[PDB]
Amino acid sequence: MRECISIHVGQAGVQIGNACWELYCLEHGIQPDGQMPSDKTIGGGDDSFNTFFSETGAGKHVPRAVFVDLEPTVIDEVRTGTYRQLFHPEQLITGKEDAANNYARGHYTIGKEIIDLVLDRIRKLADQCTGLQGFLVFHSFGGGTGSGFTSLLMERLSVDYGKKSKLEFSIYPAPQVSTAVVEPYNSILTTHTTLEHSDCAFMVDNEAIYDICRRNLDIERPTYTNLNRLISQIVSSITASLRFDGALNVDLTEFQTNLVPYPRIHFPLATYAPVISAEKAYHEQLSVAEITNACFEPANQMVKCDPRHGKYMACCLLYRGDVVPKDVNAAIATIKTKRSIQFVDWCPTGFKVGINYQPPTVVPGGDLAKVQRAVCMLSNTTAIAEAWARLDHKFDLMYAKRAFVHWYVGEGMEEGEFSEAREDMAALEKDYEEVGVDSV
Template identity: 25%
Template structure:
């Protein structure tokens, strides 16, 4: 049995991790009626309590303790497949210690895949130094992660507001249930509602779909390390756009089950993305579809062929699709779909982040808070923004091939 370790760092990472744990328990309880802690459940969840903040100071101070906790968690795995790191980019603990743990994982377990879920701050973030934290963290993610799933706070807010609006307008057929995990923490095993639970539930549901093949059987199971193998053709271009459908389940809202083909169309709609981006007007390097429930391989193939003409892929990877089928659907639903797209549309997010960074850095605003820390020098900031600029330029180079792709299409039409 393949297994993975979830590493939660910082307030955001721990809150998302707790929601992931709660909803996973609900999911496994719906399948395992005997309530036994079975193999499917034990493939995850050994929480690492780092009890530290910051990359330079506390990371170094508690390195041995962090390594020991990670090794203990890894020793409980029969076949360690990957590490999940869940953290935020804007805060000090998530960005600093989170990326420090990522470096430790590379040093101690170099052969094990490192998948990171990173929550990016909105432009109205209440942490004034979040552009510094985020750009410093971006360098570490680019250099040391195998795969990053960027999540934008504002996208989560928009999704929640949209669901509430649809509910109040009657478009969902009924009001959202009081026990819904989509709007409160009451849908989990226990505990009172906490701030951001509604947003964290969206991320947790994405992770449930992502890990479904590792927890349940299926006719076409996808190993987690296959995501990196199939979706990352260039090492640094490993930032994937995630979209989820449905965004809620029948356990949360009383709605008719949507048609299967509509589910595939929704997965490529901007309304279902966990990051503000426009994939259809940019280039796909590769795409993965992770499907759960009563879905056949023929359904997958039919919908891929139906959608392909509208999705601009790079010319050298027109067949860059990876698919997975898990037989167990989400609680209260017949099927679900998580789409992961390696697409150049993430570039505007990075450009905006760089612009916000430069507005502060040009004035050297708040820089003294960092420079008084041992090991933090101004070169750390220049190197970090240089790394981000290089990443943006790599995406520019891929985007530049879009014209070549159009020329090939025009040549084909002339030949025909």
């Protein structure tokens, strides 16, 4: 019961999916042929991990996931990679032509050619679920598939699954790795279109993640492999609540209740700790006080923005590993003495805590040290709107001269879709301002 279906869309989505699913198998003791010596529930079961892995009579544990790209290159690596026995071939879906960093191609031209098969395959996953809870959609903001096809899929998923929950892990462009000058365009259009279809989107800033890799791991020039492995550790923490259980566990939906005060205000900010290399973690065992402190250093956020210059509407701490309430309570308390984490006046100022006692693990050959405990803080803060403002400004500079717009009109889009998307974001930005003003 309570199964979740992951959907990884486009290059970034798929390569994050490699990172996440590789980590999931290591955390659950699943081997690359799907076999899990631990599970004596052959061919089925209702253990906590079964939210994310179906089972076959052969004992193979199969991701409840779907990779879809409009181009075969990157999924072909899944197809021939180490973990290639995990999946039924039909979970790995590719076209031939990609969306060429174009939202229109990904949402209309190319994507409409494959949307029905993707749904037809998502349906096949849904029908092995006894209590399907919702979807996890991993995609980038910036690519033509990550933007255009995801928002297409999301519309289609609302129609076919009602208000069944859809959470996003969205990859927010960084100019250090930005592959297209039109990424702001794609970013605005996809955000406008999935906004009323997403219940909760965790934005992952490539520049934040990139900065953290350079700084906390002395990685001279991080690669997508560097980023995705760190990203996956954050995703592991957010989904741990779903994949493991214990007394102190707190289901991610319980956090979602606190995290979303209004439907459009559904973009939490994540902060993770410790991010630390083996060389530096050797002989430095990190207390729950140190990792909790590190939550409130902005260097460890997944989006670059200043919570110090916005207001909180929620603060959650998601602990995994050797971590006890008493120690958490102590750490939080000194944080409250030593920090003014101000909330909006319509909002209680509690910090909501969860503890998954299963300790994090690492993918071998990583640079992240294997730590005993970890924390991911999920807060709703008006400061995350800075990430809309940065993108909205880049859209504006180009759209005022209509730069590159012709590539979109050429595929059937109208300028009006641009203006209407840009205005939604204008309105989202003032939503974020309004919720921060004091009541009267």
